[PDB]
């Protein structure tokens, strides 16, 4: 019982390192596509066709979790990868200040405003549509970078599942106190678990680093064409409004069905 908690803490530390490791590839991949050029004719269709022709199936652990009742909420319509259609509830106001310190609140509030796209698929589609149409951009390169990004963001948030299992063993009593509470509805248990999983100080740490990375990696050199406007804003928005809150919900969903382990 000590030993198992210790092991889980160790395991959590390693999985968190794996989660952070997606930060730079996601940002570089967005920047590669943004530096490359405008949108090709029928690029969106070609992205769907590429996902169909090169269908990567998730791991057996993930594919079986996606068949359970809590995991099924993150299964996408084929040929989209897992979790890229998942819609978090709106939690911010239209005018919420997203990326500057606010007196009496803090900085980098998580989640969607009413005007944010519903899910990652729509967010990335909206980003693609904001580009100008181009007859010179290479279709194969553009689609291949689009597909890379979809696979990256799916794998990134899916790490919430093994992270949640490790957190459960590490913080066993905390979660079991919620799970075995017979006064709480299913949704109140979900809310209480999400709150237990949420650490905004760590969220600010990540998003501050993402903002630095997006500025440093978007540096312009001799004779480079500038990035489209708002490129850095949308990189931050991807993490702040989607990747972080969806990861937390995946972790909560994984925890919720574990009362028999208490």
């Amino acid at each position: 019982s000590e030993a198992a908690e210790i092991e889980a803490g160790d395991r959590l530390d390693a999985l968190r390192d794996q989660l952070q490791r997606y930060e730079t590839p996601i940002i570089q991949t967005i920047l590669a596509r943004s530096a490359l050029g405008g949108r090709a004719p029928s690029e969106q269709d070609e992205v769907r066709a590429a996902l169909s022709r090169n269908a990567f199936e998730p791991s057996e652990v993930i594919s079986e979790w996606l068949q359970t009742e809590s995991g099924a909420r993150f299964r996408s319509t084929r040929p989209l990868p897992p979790a890229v259609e998942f819609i978090t509830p709106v939690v911010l106001s239209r005018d919420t200040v997203l990326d500057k310190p606010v007196v009496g609140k803090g900085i980098f509030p998580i989640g969607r405003r009413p005007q944010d796209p519903t899910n990652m698929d729509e967010f990335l589609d909206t980003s693609l549509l904001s580009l100008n149409q181009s007859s010179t951009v290479d279709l194969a390169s553009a689609v291949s970078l689009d597909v890379s990004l979809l696979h990256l963001v799916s794998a990134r948030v899916l790490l919430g599942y093994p992270i949640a299992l490790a957190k459960f063993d590490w913080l066993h009593d905390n979660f079991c106190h919620i799970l075995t509470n017979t006064t709480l509805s299913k949704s109140q248990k979900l809310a209480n678990i999400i709150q237990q999983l949420t650490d905004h100080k760590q969220e600010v740490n990540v998003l501050s680093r993402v903002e630095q990375k997006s500025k440093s990696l978007s540096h312009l050199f001799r004779n480079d064409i500038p990035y489209p406007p708002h490129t850095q804003d949308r990189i931050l928005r991807l993490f702040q409004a989607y990747l972080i809150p969806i990861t937390t919900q995946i972790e909560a969903a994984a925890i919720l069905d574990h009362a028999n382990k208490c």
């Binding site: 160790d10 009496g104 905004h200 760590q202």
Partner: protein, 157 residues
């Protein structure tokens, strides 16, 4: 009234000997702090908010780091109160009769600890004002203390 939220098994990881968590003991977590009375009794601890130092992550209120000459503090999770004191000032009173105004920039996180994210340090206690060196120097306190009995209040406008 304020109760613990739970506890965490200590792991020392690669931490040196700021105190590390020790193997073989548990560390208490809190979501709450004592009542804010307008002259709230607290323990002042010593911390660097500077970027290079590797003491910590970015400040919760601002995402920034602060060099040791800035009079800034972190507050235990309960007093941090979801950010309601972010970029506001508190007046700190020391037992020697000195007082100083300090900017709240960060959370002294009592909900989590003894993990790689926190360099294997324990969760903050629940009644802490974690002050920069310039805070201690302004209060005339000897930083070799490590902690001091204080009172604090919000600076209202």
């Amino acid at each position: 009234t304020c109760q613990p939220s739970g506890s965490i098994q200590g792991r020392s990881g690669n931490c040196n000997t700021s105190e590390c968590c020790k193997n073989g003991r548990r560390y208490t977590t809190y979501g709450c702090s004592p009542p804010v009375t307008g002259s709230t009794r607290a323990v002042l601890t010593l911390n660097s908010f500077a970027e290079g130092g590797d003491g910590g992550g970015a400040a919760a209120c601002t995402g920034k780091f602060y060099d040791d000459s800035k009079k800034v503090v972190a507050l235990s999770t309960g007093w941090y109160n979801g950010g309601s004191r972010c970029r506001k000032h508190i007046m700190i009173h020391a037992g020697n009769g000195n007082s100083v105004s300090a900017l709240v920039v960060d959370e002294c996180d009592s909900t989590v600890g003894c993990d790689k994210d926190h360099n294997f340090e324990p969760p903050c206690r629940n009644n802490i004002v974690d002050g920069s060196p310039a805070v201690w120097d302004a209060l005339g306190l000897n930083k070799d203390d490590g902690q001091a009995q204080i009172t604090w209040s919000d600076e209202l406008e």
